[PDB]
Chains A and B, each alone.
Chain A
Amino acid sequence: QIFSSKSIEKVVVHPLVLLSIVDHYNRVARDTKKRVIGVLLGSTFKGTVDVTNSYAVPFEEDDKDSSIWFLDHNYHESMFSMFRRINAKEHVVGWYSTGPKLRENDLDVHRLFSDYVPNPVLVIIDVQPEELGIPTKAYYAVEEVKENATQKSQKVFVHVPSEIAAHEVEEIGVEHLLRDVKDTTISTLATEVTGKLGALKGLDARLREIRSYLELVIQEKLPLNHEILYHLQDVFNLLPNLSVLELVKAFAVKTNDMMLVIYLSSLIRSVIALHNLINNKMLNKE
Chain B
Amino acid sequence: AASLFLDSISTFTTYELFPYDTFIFYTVLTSIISLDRVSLKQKVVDAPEILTVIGKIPYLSEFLNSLYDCQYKSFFSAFAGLTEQIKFDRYLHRHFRYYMREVRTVVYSQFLESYKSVTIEAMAKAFGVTVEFIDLELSRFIAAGKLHCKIDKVVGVLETNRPDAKNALYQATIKQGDFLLNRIQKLSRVIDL
List the interface of chain A (C-beta within 8 A of B).
Answer: 253, 256, 260, 263, 267, 270-271, 274, 277-278, 281
Contact = CB atoms under 8 A, between A and B. Distances in A.
Nearest to B180: A267
A278 B184 CA distance: 12
A158 to B, nearest CB: 51
Interface residues of B, number: 11
A256 B184 CA distance: 24
Nearest to A275: B184
Interface in B138-185: 166, 170, 173, 177, 180-181, 184
Contacts of B16: none
Contacts of A278: 191
Nearest to B166: A253
A253 B169 CA distance: 13
Interface of B: 166, 170, 173, 177, 180-181, 184, 187-188, 191-192
B187 A274 contact: yes
Interface of A (DSSP majority class): helix
B177 A274 contact: no
Nearest to A260: B173
A274 B192 contact: no
B192 A281 contact: yes
A270 B191 contact: no
Contacts of A277: 188, 191-192
B184 A274 contact: yes
A269 to B, nearest CB: 11
Given A277-B188, A277-B192, 5 more contacts: A267-B177, A271-B184, A274-B187, A281-B191, A281-B192
Contacts of B177: 263, 267
Nearest to A270: B184
Contacts, number: 20
A219 B187 CA distance: 72
16 contacts: A253-B166, A256-B170, A260-B170, A260-B173, A267-B180, A267-B181, A270-B181, A270-B184, A271-B184, A274-B184, A274-B187, A274-B188, A277-B188, A277-B191, A277-B192, A281-B191
- 8 nearest interchain CB pairs? A274-B184, A270-B184, A274-B188, A278-B191, A281-B191, A281-B192, A267-B180, A263-B177
Contacts of B181: 267, 270
Contacts of B180: 267
Nearest to A271: B184
A274 B191 CA distance: 10
A267 B184 CA distance: 10
Contacts of A260: 170, 173
B66 to A, nearest CB: 42
A259 B51 CA distance: 52
A278 to B, nearest CB: 6
Nearest to A257: B166
A36 B60 CA distance: 99
A156 B10 CA distance: 86
Contacts of B184: 270-271, 274
A263 B187 CA distance: 20
Contacts of B191: 277-278, 281
B171 to A, nearest CB: 12
B168 to A, nearest CB: 14
A281 B170 CA distance: 36
Contacts of A271: 184
Nearest to B192: A281
A263 to B, nearest CB: 7
A271 B181 CA distance: 10
A267 B166 CA distance: 21
A262 to B, nearest CB: 12
A54 to B, nearest CB: 60
Nearest to A253: B166
A274 B170 CA distance: 26
B167 to A, nearest CB: 10
A242 to B, nearest CB: 24
